[PDB]
Structures are given as structure tokens and as C-alpha cells.
Amino acid sequence: AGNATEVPANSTVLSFCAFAVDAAKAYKDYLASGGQPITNCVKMLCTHTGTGQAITVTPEANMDQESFGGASCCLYCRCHIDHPNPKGFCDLKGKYVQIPTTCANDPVGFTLKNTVCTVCGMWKGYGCSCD
């Protein structure tokens, strides 16, 4: 009974971060040791004529981004572990995340390392025009 959610390619990294005290550090160290990025993310078929904002209610990918389902880009949702923010709730689950095409191979790692500009809503270093 039940429906499989994962593929065998993710078993090692998911089990490693599922047991870690600091899962974010464990994932970054896993990548640094030559480990493969988490795969089986929710990649969207979209027009690519969107605003380009980082976290949206609908896919807003532009010609330089790929749109993904938010929960699938969150290490804490992927491992089924506690979220690090004090309220314990997710900011990616329930939304779509726009990831630059050059970083689309590792969406979970991209969201773990980068921040969204509170002014323009674009990723810092990847679309934020502000100073």
C-alpha cells in the first residue's frame, strides 16, 4: 500500500540530511564531497514570459529562469525535517520558485544558499538591480 514519492538516486543524500543536526551544512558538505544534487524536483512547463520574481503564486519564469514547485526546492520539505525559522513553517511550500537556468541543476542548493531582495523581489546576484 502507499505511493512512492522518491527515486533511488536520492536515497543517500536524503538519508544523510534526514539524520543531520545541521541539515543545511550536511547538504553543502555533501555537495563539496562530490555528491550529486537532489533530483526529482517539480519542474514547470511555462511560457517563460513571466515577471522574473523569485517566489510567486503562479510560475513567473523569464527567458533566463526555470520555474519549480516550491516544496520540491526546499531541503526541509524534501527530508521531512524541522524548518529552521522560529515559527517552524515553510516559505517555499505553497509557492513557485524561479531558479536561474545556470543553477537549475541544483534547485535545492540554490534556495539554501541565496536570498531574495526584500525591495525588488528578485534573487541577489541573479536579477536584483538594487545596491
Binding site: T5, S11, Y30, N40, L45
Partner: protein, 285 residues
């Protein structure tokens, strides 16, 4: 090709909305087209779901610099025979709102300790994963009728994991700087470890120079077996699966070839005792 790790065990006949699905596989079929997913304005997210996620299927074969391996070789386990603790878990099955996974019920150790836990699972919700009590039934059969009373005599996991750390500390403070859990068909024991074990780089005790064997969530601190009072997690434990040593039959039949002083009382701690006994006889004779 799929795995049973993180298998969705809910009874809901539909999948998840693309924004709430942890994976492409779990996205509802309505949204799937040409290997990808589409957003359908007018088909909204679900804000009330509770989906039990299975913790059966972990694979601890990571190779990360600075992170010790949990599963050790037979020769390394022999060197740390003082740290050996037999471990076995008798589980219950998920029922009513979920089906398809086993939850830890009675945790047994070669120390003779048996701890009964409240059937608890990892339930995904629209906001996070809720570690909470779930409906469960003892396994179908008469060799498991001793578990029926235990369904109501369990302790919450915050209490159970404190008792495990206290028991291991009292047993191992004068014997070893480690714990080596000695297992037979490790699958369910490794699943159960997710409930009371944490891993990371090697650390030292906050009160001394001995290696850290315990962790506290409350204070974000590490402790050896001598200073772990109040600690809730087993930190960086080691383990080995005796079943994988080329034995042809079941635990009891292999244990009984060398030992006649441990009669099977059909309880978690009895299996744990038999496992450590079999490991000693196999490794040192």
C-alpha cells in the same frame, strides 16, 4: 524505478498540487504533461491535508569528509567490543488515516531494557512535517498478541529518547568512548534510530575532552557518556548488521548453535540479547 523511502501512506486517492508536492512523482496526474508539470489556475492548493510519510528505506552509505560512517567493518567492531549494545525494535502498523508503514512500539536492548513508545510518525501538512501520534495496530497475528496491551502503555518520544540516552550513558561511561549497536536485519532498527539519533562531524564534550556521544536540542550542546544528564539524542553512534555475516537461517536458530542460556521470551530485548551473544560467539571463537 522508485524507492520505499518517504513513501506517501495516506488514503487520499489524488496527488499533490505542484507547489506542495515534495517531488515530481507526488504531483497529481492532472498537472502532468510531457515529463513536466503545469500550473492550472482554478485548481487550488489543499490547506488541510495530513499525509503520513514512511521512514522505512534509509541508506547510510554517504562518504563525506569529516563525517564518520555509522556502519562499521567487523574488524573495527571487534576492536570496540566494549561498546556493543544489541538493539531490536518490535513495531506496529499504520492504520485508519494511513496504511503502508511501520512505527516503533517496543525498543529492546541487550542491557535487558524494553521501552514502549506512543505510535508516532512523520505527517506532512501544507506548512511543514508534524512529528505526531498516529493511529496504529499491532501486527496481524498471534506471535504479536503481547503488543496489544503495549498500544496504551507507551511514552511520548521526547521521554523515550531521554531514557535511551540515560540507559546508554549508565552502561557505557566506564566501558567505551562510543556505542556500537549490534543488529540483525537492520532496516527497522535504522528507521527507529531516526527518532533518537543525530549525526554530524566529530565533536568534544562541553564539560571535558572526551568525544561527544550525546546531543541536546534544548541547549544545542554535546556531551560524553559521563556528562549527558538531560540529553535527548544519541550523537554519532556506530552499528553493524550481524545478519550480513553469511548466516543462512533466522536469529534464534543461529544463536542456539553456540548458546543455550538465552531462551526466546519473544520480546524486543530478548532478540537484542541474542544478537549481541551471537556476535561475540561468531567473532571471538
Amino acid at each position: 524505478n522508485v524507492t520505499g523511502l518517504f513513501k506517501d501512506c495516506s488514503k487520499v486517492i489524488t496527488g499533490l498540487h505542484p507547489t506542495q508536492a515534495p517531488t515530481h512523482l507526488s504531483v497529481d496526474t492532472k498537472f502532468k504533461t510531457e515529463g513536466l508539470c503545469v500550473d492550472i489556475p482554478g485548481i487550488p492548493k489543499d490547506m488541510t491535508y495530513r499525509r503520513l510519510i514512511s521512514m522505512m528505506g534509509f541508506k547510510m552509505n554517504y562518504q563525506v569528509n569529516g563525517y564518520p560512517n555509522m556502519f562499521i567493518t567487523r574488524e573495527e567492531a571487534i576492536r570496540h567490543v566494549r561498546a556493543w549494545i544489541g538493539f531490536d525494535v518490535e513495531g506496529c502498523h499504520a492504520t485508519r488515516e494511513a496504511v503502508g508503514t511501520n512505527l516503533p512500539l517496543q525498543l529492546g536492548f541487550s542491557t535487558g531494557v524494553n521501552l514502549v513508545a506512543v505510535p508516532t510518525g512523520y505527517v506532512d501538512t501544507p506548512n511543514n512535517t508534524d512529528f505526531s501520534r498516529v493511529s496504529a495496530k499491532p501486527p496481524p497475528g498471534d506471535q504479536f498478541k503481547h503488543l496489544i496491551p503495549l498500544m496504551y502503555k507507551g511514552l511520548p518520544w521526547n521521554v523515550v529518547r531521554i531514557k535511551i540516552v540515560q540507559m546508554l550513558s549508565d552502561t557505557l561511561k566506564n566501558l567505551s568512548d562510543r556505542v556500537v549497536f549490534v543488529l540483525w536485519a537492520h532496516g527497522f532498527e535504522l528507521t527507529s534510530m531516526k527518532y533518537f539519533v543525530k549525526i554530524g562531524p566529530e565533536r568534544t564534550c562541553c564539560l571535558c575532552d572526551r568525544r561527544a556521544t550525546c546531543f541536546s536540542t534544548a541547549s544545542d550542546t554535546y556531551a560524553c557518556w559521563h556528562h549527558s544528564i538531560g540529553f535527548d539524542y544519541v550523537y554519532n553512534p556506530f552499528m553493524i548488521d550481524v545478519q550480513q555475516w553469511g548466516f543462512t537461517g533466522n536469529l534464534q536458530s543461529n544463536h542456539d548453535l553456540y548458546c543455550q542460556v538465552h531462551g526466546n521470551a519473544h520480546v524486543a530485548s530478548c532478540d537484542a540479547i541474542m544478537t549481541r551473544c551471537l556476535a561475540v560467539h561468531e567473532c571471538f571463537v
